[PDB]
mmCIF file of C-alpha atoms and ligand atoms in Angstrom:
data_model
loop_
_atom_site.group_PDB
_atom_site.id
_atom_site.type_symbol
_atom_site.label_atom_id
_atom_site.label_comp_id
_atom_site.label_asym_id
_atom_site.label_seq_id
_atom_site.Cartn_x
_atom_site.Cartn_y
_atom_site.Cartn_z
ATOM 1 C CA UNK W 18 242.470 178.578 -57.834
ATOM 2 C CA UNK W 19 239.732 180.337 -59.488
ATOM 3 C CA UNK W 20 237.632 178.543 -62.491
ATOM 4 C CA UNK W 21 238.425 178.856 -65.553
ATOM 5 C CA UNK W 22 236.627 177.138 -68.692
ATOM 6 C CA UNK W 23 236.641 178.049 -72.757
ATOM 7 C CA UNK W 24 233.498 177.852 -75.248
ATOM 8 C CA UNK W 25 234.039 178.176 -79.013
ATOM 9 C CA UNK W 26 231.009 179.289 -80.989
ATOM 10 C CA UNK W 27 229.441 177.769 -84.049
ATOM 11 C CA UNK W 28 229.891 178.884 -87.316
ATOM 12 C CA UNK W 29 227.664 181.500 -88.698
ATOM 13 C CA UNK W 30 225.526 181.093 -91.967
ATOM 14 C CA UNK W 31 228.191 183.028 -94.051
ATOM 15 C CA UNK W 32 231.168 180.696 -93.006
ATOM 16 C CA UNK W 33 228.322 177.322 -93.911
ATOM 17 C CA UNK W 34 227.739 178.840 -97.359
ATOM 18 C CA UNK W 35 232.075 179.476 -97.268
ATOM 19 C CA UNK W 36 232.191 175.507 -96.194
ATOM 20 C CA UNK W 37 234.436 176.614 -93.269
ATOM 21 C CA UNK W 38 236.331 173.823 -91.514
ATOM 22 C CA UNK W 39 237.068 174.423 -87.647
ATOM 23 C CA UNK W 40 240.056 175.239 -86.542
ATOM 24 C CA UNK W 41 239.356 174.037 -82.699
ATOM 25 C CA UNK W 42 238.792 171.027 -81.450
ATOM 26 C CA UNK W 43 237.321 170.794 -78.149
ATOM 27 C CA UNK W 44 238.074 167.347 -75.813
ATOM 28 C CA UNK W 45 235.499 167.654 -72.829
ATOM 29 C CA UNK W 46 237.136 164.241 -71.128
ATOM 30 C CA UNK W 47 240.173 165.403 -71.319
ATOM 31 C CA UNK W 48 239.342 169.386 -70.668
ATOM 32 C CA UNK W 49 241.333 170.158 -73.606
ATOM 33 C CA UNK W 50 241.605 172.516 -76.087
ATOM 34 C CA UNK W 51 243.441 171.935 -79.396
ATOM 35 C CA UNK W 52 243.629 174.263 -82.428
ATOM 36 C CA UNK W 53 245.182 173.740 -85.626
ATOM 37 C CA UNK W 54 247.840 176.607 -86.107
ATOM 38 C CA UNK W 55 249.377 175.450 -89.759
ATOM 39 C CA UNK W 56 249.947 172.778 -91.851
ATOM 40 C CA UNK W 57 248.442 170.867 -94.409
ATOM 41 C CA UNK W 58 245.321 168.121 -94.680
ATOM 42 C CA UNK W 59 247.702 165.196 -93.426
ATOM 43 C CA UNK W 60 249.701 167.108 -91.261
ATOM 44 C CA UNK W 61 249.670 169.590 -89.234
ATOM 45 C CA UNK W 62 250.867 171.490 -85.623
ATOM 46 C CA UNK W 63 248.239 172.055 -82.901
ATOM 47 C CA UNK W 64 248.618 174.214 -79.844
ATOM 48 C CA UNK W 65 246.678 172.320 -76.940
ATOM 49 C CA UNK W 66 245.720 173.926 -73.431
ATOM 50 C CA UNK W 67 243.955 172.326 -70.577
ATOM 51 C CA UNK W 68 241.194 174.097 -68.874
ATOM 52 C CA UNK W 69 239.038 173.103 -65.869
ATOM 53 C CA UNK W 70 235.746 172.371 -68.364
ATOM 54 C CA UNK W 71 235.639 172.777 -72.237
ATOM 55 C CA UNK W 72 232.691 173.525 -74.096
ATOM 56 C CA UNK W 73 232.647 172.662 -77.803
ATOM 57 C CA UNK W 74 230.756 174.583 -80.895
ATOM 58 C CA UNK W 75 227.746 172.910 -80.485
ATOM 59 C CA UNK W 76 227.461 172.934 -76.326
ATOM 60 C CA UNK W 77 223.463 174.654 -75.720
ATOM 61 C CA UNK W 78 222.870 177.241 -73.068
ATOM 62 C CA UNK W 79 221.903 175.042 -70.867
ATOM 63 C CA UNK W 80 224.577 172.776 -70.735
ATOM 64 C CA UNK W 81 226.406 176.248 -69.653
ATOM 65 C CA UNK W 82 224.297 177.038 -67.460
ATOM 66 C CA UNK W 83 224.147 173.534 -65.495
ATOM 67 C CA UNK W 84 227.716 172.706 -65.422
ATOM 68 C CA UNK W 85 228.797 176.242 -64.992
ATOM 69 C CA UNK W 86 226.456 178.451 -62.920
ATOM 70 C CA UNK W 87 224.361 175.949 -61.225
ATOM 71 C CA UNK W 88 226.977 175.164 -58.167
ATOM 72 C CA UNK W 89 227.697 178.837 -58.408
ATOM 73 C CA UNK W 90 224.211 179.685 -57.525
ATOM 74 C CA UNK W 91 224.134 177.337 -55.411
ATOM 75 C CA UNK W 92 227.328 179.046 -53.252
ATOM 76 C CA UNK W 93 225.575 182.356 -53.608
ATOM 77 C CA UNK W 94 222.617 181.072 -51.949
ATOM 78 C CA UNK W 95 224.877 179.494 -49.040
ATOM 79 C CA UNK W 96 225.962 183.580 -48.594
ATOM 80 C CA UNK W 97 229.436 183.261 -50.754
ATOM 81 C CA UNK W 98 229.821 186.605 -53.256
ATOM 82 C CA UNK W 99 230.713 184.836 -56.713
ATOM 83 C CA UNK W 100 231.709 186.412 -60.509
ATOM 84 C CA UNK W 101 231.590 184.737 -63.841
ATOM 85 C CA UNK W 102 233.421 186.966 -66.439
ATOM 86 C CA UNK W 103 233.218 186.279 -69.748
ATOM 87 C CA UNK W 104 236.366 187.240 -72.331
ATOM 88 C CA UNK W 105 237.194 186.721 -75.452
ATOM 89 C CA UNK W 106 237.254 188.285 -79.149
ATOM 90 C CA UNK W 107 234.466 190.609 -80.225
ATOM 91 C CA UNK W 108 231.866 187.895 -82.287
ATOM 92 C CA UNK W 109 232.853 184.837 -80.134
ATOM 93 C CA UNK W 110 229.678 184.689 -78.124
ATOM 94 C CA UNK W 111 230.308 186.647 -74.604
ATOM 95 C CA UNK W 112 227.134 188.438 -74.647
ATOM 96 C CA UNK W 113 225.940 185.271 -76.283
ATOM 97 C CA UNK W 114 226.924 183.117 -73.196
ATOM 98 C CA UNK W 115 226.115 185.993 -70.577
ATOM 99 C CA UNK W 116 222.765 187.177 -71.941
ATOM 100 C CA UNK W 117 221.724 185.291 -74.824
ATOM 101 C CA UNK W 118 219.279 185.848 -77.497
ATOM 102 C CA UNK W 119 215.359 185.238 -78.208
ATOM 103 C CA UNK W 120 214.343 182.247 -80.393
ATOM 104 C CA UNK W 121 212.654 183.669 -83.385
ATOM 105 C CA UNK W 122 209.063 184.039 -84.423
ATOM 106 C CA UNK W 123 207.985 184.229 -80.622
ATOM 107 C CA UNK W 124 208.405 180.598 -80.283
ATOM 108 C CA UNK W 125 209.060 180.307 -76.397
ATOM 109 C CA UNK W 126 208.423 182.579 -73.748
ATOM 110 C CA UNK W 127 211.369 184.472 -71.854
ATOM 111 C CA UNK W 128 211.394 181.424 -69.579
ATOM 112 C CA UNK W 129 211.244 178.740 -71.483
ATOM 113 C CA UNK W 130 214.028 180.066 -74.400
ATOM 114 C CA UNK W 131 216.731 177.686 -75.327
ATOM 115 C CA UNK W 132 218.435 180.396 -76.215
ATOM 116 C CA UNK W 133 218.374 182.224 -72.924
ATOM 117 C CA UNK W 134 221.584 182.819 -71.464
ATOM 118 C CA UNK W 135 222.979 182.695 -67.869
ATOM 119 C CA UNK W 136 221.538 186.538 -66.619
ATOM 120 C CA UNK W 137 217.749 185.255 -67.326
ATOM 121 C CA UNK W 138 218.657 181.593 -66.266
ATOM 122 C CA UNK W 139 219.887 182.893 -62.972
ATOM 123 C CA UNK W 140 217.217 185.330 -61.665
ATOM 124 C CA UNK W 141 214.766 182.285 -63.005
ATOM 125 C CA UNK W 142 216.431 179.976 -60.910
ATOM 126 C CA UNK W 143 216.715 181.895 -58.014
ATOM 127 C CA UNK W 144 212.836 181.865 -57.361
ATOM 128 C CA UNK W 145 212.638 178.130 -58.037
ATOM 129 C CA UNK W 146 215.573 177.381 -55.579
ATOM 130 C CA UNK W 147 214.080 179.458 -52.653
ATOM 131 C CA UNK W 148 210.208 179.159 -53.605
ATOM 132 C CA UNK W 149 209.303 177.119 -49.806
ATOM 133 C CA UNK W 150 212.636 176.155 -48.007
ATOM 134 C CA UNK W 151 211.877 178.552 -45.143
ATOM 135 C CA UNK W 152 214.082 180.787 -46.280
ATOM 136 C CA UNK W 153 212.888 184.574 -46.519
ATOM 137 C CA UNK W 154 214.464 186.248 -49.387
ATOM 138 C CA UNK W 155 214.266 189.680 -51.551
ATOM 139 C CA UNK W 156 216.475 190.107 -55.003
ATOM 140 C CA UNK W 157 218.271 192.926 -56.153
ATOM 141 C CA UNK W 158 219.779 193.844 -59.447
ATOM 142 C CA UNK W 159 221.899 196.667 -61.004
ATOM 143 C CA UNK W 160 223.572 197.261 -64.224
ATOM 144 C CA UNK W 161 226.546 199.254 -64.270
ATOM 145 C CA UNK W 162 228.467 199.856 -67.522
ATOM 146 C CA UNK W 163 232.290 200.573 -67.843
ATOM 147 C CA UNK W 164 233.191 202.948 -71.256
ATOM 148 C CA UNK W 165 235.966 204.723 -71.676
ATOM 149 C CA UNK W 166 236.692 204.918 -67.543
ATOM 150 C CA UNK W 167 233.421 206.415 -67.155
ATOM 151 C CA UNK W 168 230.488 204.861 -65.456
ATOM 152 C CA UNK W 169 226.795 204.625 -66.764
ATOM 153 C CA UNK W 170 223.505 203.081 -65.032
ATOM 154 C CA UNK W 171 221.557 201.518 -67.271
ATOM 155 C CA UNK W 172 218.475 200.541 -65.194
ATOM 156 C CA UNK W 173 218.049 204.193 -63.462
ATOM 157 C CA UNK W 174 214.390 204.788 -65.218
ATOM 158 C CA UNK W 175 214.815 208.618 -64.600
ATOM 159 C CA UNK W 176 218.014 209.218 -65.508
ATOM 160 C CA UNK W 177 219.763 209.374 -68.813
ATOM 161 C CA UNK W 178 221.775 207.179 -69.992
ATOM 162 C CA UNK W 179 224.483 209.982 -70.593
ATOM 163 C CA UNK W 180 224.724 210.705 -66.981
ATOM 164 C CA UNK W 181 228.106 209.359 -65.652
ATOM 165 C CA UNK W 182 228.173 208.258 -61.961
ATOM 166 C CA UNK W 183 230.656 209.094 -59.423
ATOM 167 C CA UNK W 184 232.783 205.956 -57.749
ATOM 168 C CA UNK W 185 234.193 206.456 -54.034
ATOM 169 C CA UNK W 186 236.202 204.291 -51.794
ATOM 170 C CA UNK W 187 233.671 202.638 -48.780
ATOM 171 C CA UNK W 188 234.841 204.032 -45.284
ATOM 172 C CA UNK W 189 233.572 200.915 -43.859
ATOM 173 C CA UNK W 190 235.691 198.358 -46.511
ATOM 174 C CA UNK W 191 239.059 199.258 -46.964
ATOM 175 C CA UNK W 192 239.482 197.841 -50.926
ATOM 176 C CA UNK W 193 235.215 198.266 -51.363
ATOM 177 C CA UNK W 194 233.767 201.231 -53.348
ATOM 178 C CA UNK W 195 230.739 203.457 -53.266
ATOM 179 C CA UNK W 196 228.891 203.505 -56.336
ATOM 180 C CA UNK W 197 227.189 207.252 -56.241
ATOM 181 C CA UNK W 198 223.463 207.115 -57.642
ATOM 182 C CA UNK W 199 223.636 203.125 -58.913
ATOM 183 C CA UNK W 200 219.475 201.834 -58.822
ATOM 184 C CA UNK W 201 219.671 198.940 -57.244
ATOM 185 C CA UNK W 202 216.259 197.557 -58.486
ATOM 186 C CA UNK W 203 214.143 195.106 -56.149
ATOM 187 C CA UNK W 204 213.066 192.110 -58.501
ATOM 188 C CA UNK W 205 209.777 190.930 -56.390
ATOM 189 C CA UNK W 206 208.957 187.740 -58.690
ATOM 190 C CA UNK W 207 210.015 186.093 -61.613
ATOM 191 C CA UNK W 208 207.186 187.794 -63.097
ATOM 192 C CA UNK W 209 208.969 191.476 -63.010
ATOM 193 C CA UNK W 210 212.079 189.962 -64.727
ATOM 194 C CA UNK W 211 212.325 190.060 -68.369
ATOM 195 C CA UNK W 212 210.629 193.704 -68.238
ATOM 196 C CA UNK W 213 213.701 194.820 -66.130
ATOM 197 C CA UNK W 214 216.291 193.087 -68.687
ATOM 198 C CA UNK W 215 214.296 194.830 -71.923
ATOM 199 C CA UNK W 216 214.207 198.343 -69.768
ATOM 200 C CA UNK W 217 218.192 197.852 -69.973
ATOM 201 C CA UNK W 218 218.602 196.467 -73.594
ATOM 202 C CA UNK W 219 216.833 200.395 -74.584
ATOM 203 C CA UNK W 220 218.896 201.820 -72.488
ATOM 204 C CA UNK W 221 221.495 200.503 -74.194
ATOM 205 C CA UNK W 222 220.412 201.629 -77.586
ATOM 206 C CA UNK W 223 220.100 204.811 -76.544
ATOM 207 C CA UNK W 224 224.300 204.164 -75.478
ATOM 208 C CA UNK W 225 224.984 202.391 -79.024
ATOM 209 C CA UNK W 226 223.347 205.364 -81.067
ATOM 210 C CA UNK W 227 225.809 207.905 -78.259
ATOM 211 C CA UNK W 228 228.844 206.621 -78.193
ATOM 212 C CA UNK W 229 231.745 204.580 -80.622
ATOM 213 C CA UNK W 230 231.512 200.893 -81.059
ATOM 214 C CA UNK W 231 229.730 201.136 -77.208
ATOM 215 C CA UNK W 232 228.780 197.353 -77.568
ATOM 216 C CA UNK W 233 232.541 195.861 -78.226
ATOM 217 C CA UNK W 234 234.270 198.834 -75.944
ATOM 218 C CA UNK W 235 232.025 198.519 -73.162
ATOM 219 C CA UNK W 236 232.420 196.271 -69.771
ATOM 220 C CA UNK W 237 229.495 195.509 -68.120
ATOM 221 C CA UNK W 238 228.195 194.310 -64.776
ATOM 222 C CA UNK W 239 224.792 192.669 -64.389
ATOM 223 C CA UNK W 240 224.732 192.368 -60.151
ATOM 224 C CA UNK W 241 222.259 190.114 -58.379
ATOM 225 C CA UNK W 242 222.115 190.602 -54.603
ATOM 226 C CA UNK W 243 220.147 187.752 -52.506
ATOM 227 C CA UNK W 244 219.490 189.105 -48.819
ATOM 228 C CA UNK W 245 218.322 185.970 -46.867
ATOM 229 C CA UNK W 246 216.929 185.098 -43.769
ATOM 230 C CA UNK W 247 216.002 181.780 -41.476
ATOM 231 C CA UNK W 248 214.693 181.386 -38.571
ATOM 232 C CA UNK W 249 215.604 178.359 -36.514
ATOM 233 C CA UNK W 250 213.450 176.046 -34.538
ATOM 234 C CA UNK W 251 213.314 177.811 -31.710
ATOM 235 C CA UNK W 252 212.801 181.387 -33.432
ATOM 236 C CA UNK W 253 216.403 182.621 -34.354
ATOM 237 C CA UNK W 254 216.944 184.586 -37.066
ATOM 238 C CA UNK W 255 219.737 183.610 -39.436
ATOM 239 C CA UNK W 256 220.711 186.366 -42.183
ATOM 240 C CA UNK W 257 222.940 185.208 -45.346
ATOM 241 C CA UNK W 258 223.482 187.755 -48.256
ATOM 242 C CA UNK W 259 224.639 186.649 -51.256
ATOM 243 C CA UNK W 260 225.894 188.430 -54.534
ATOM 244 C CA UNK W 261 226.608 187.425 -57.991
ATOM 245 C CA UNK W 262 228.844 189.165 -60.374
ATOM 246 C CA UNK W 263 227.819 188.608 -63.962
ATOM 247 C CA UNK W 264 230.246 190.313 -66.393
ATOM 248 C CA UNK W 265 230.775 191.161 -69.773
ATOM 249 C CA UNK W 266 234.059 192.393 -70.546
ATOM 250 C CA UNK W 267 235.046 194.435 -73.618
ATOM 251 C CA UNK W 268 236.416 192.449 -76.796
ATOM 252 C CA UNK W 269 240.043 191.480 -75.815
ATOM 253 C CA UNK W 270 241.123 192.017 -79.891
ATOM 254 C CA UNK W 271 243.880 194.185 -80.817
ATOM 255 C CA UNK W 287 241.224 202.637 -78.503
ATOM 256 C CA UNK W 288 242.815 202.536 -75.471
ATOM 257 C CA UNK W 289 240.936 200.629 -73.138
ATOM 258 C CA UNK W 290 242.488 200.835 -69.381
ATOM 259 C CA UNK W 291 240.284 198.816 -67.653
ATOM 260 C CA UNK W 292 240.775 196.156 -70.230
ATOM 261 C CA UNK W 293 244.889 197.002 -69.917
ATOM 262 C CA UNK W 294 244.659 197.079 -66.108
ATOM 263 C CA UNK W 295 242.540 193.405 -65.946
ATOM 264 C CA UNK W 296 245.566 191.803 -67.722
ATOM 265 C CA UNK W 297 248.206 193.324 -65.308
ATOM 266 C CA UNK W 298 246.290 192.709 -62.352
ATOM 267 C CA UNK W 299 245.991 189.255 -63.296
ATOM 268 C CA UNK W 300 249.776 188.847 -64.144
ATOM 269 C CA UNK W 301 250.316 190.596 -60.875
ATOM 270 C CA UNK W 302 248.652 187.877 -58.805
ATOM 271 C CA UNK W 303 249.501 185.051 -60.867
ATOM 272 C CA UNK W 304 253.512 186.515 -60.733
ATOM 273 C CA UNK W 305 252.646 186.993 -57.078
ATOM 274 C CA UNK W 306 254.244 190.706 -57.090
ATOM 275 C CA UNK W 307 253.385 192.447 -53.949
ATOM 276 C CA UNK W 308 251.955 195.334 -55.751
ATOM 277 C CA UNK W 309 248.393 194.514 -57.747
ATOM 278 C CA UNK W 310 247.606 197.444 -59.434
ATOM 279 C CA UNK W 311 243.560 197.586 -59.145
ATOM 280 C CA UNK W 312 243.438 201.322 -58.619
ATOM 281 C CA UNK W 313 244.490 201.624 -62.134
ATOM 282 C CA UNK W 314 241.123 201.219 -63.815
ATOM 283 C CA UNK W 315 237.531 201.298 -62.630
ATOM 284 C CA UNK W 316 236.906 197.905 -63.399
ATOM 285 C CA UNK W 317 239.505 196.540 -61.125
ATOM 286 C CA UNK W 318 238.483 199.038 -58.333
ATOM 287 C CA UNK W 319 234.819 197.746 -58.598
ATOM 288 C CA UNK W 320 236.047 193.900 -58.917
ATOM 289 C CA UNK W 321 238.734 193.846 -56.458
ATOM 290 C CA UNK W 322 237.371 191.384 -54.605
ATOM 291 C CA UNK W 323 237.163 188.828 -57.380
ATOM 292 C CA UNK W 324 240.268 188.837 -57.918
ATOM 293 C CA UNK W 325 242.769 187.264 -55.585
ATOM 294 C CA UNK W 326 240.195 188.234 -52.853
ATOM 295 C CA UNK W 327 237.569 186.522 -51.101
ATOM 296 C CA UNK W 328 234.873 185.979 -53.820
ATOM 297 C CA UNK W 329 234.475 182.652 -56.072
ATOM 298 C CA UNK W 330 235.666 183.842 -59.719
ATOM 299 C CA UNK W 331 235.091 181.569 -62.590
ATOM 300 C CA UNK W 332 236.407 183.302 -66.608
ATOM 301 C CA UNK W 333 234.324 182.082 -68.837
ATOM 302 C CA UNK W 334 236.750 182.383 -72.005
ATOM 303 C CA UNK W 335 235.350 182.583 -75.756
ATOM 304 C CA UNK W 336 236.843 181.763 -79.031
ATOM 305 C CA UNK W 337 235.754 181.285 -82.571
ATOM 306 C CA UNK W 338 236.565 178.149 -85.091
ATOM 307 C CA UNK W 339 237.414 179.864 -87.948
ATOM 308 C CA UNK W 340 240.934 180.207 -89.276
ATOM 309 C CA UNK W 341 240.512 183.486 -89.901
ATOM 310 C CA UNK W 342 240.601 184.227 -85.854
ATOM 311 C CA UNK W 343 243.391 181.976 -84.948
ATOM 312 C CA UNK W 344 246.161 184.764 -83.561
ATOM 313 C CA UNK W 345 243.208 186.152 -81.481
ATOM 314 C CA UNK W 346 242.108 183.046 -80.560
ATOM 315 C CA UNK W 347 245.449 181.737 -79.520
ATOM 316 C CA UNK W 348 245.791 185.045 -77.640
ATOM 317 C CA UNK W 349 242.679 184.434 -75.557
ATOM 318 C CA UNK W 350 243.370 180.509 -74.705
ATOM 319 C CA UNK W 351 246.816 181.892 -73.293
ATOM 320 C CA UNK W 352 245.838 184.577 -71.195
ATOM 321 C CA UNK W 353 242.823 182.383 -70.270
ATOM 322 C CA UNK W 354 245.352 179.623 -69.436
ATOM 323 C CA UNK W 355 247.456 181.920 -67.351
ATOM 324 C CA UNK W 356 244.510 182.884 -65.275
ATOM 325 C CA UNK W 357 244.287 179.617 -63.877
ATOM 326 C CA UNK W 358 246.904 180.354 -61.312
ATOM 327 C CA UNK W 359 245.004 183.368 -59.768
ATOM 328 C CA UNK W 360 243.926 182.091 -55.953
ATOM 329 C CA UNK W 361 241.297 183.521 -54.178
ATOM 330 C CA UNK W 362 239.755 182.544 -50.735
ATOM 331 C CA UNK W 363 236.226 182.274 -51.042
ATOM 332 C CA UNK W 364 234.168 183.454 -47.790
HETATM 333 N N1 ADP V 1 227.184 179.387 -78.766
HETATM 334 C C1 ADP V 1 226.509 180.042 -79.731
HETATM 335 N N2 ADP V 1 225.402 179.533 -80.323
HETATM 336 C C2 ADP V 1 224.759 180.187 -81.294
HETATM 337 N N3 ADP V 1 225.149 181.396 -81.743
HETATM 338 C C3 ADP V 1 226.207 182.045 -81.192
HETATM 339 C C4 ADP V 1 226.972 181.386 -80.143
HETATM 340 N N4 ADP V 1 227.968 182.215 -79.790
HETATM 341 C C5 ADP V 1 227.883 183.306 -80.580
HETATM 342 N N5 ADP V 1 226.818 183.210 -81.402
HETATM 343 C C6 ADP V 1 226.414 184.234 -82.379
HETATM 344 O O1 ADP V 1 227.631 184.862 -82.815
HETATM 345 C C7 ADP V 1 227.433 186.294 -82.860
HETATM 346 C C8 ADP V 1 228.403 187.003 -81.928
HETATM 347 O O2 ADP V 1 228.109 186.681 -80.567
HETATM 348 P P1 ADP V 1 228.075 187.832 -79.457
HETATM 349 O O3 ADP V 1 227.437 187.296 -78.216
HETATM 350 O O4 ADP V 1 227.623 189.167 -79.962
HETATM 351 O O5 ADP V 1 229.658 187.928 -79.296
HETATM 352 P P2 ADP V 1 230.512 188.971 -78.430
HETATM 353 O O6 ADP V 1 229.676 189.534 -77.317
HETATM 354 O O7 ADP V 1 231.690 188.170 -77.963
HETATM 355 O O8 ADP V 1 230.938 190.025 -79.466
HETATM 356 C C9 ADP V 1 225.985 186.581 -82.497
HETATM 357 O O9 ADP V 1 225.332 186.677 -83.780
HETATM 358 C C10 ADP V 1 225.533 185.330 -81.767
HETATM 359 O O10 ADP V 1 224.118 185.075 -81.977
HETATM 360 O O1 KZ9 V 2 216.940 188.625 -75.609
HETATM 361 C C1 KZ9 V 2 216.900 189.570 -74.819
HETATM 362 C C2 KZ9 V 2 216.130 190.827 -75.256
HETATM 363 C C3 KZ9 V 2 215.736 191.660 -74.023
HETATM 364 C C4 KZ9 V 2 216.967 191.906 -73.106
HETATM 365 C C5 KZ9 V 2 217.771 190.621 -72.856
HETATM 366 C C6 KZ9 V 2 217.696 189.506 -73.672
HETATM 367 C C7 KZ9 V 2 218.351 188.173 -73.263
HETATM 368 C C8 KZ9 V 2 217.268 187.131 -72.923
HETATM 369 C C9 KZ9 V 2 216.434 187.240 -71.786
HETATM 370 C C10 KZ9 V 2 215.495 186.228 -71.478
HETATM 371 C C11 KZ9 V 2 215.423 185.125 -72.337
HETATM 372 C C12 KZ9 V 2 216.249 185.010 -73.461
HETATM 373 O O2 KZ9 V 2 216.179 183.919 -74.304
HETATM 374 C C13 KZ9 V 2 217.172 186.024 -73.760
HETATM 375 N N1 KZ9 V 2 219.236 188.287 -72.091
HETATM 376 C C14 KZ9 V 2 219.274 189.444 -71.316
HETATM 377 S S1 KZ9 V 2 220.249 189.587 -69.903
HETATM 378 N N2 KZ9 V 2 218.513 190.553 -71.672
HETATM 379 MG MG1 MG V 3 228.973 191.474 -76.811
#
């Protein structure tokens, strides 16, 4: 089965200044997830859900990022392919959890942020993990954006942002696709990183200022590929590739968003175990095919806010979250 685990976000200042009360109640011994759904003070009914790790309001990145991503890293390094998605409401904290955010008043370097998310964590790590093992190694990164079933680079320096890209099938994988004119950029250190993630945060902008509500209606994929290579005692070369899937789906609240449509029916699809998955109806489920019920480690990482005012959406997400669970994939 793939992974799936649920975060709730803190309240903001304007629900502390409101004196907000949670509606979620997260149990990580128990992987639970209970929310209140009516009822007064001394009573009350809950809907509960059990998920493979919960990750309460006040969980830091970094508990994330070690009891999430750490064994994934650790897979992609061993030459699996792995995604994390992450789903969820627009203002739960996906791009929160994915990216994260700078500490303010330049208190900590890009490194060092507590607020870093698992994109900067990652590419970090990936220098620490491999820094004198004996195994030679070069990154690679891309960032290919999903809006409105049309495709958009947002690290290709010479390109516009408003160019759309062309997706074809890969002669050499049936089910694979061809990404026309997608920079793959070569990430030499962990000294080239954080210029390469602010290059893509103006690209982005530059999208925002372009097109509707770009930042909610968007999907995104942030792709790491590690190509490796050992050499045994007696001068062998081993190779190992790895690649990471970091993505940031559009909000899941109820224009028309077919890849978002076509990730839910996929999904029942597989976990219905209908012969016919329908991943040719979107470009997101062309591009992730793989990840789901294919031969790449999948983990959803699925967000949901505390406040009452969210609960239908919120229940909505912990369901089709839930349902997920069943998906099975078969990992190299
Ligand atoms: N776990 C968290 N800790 C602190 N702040 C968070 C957390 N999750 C979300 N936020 C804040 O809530 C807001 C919405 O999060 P964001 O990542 O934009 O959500 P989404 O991408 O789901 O719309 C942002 O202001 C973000 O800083
Ligand atoms: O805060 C920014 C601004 C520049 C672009 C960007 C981010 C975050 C980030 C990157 C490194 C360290 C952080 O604390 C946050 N995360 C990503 S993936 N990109
Ligand atoms: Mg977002």
């Amino acid at each position: 089965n793939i992974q799936v685990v649920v975060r709730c976000r803190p309240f903001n200042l304007a629900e502390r200044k409101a004196s907000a009360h949670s509606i979620v109640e997260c149990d990580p011994v128990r992987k639970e997830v209970s929310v209140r759904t009516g009822g007064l003070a001394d009573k009350s009914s809950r809907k509960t859900y059990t998920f493979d790790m919960v990750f309460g309001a006040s969980t830091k990145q970094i508990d994330v990022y070690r009891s999430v991503v750490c064994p994934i890293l650790d897979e992609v390094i061993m030459g699996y392919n792995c995604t994390i998605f992450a789903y969820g409401q627009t203002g739960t904290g996906k791009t929160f959890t994915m990216e994260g955010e700078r500490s303010p008043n330049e208190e900590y370097t890009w490194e060092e942020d507590p607020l870093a998310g698992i994109i900067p964590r990652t590419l970090h790590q990936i220098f620490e993990k491999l820094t004198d093992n004996g195994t030679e190694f070069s990154v690679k990164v891309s960032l290919l954006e999903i809006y409105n079933e049309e495709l958009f680079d947002l690290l290709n320096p010479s390109s516009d942002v408003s160019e759309r890209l062309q997706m074809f099938d890969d002669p050499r994988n049936k089910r694979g696709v061809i990404i026309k004119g997608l920079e793959e950029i070569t990430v030499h250190n962990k000294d080239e990183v954080y210029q390469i993630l602010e290059k893509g945060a103006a690209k982005r902008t530059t999208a925002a200022t372009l097109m509707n509500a770009y930042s909610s209606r968007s999907h995104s994929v942030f792709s790491v590929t590690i190509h490796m290579k050992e050499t045994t005692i007696d001068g062998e070369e081993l190779v190992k590739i790895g690649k990471l899937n970091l993505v940031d789906l559009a909000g899941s609240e109820n224009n028309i968003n077919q890849s978002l449509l076509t990730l839910g029916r996929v999904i029942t699809a597989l976990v219905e175990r209908t012969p016919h998955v329908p991943y040719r109806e979107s470009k997101l489920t062309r591009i992730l095919q793989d990840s789901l019920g294919g031969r790449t480690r999948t983990s959803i990482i699925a967000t949901i806010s505390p406040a009452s005012l969210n609960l239908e959406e919120t229940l909505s997400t912990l369901e089709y979250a839930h349902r997920a669970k069943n998906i099975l994939n078969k990992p190299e």
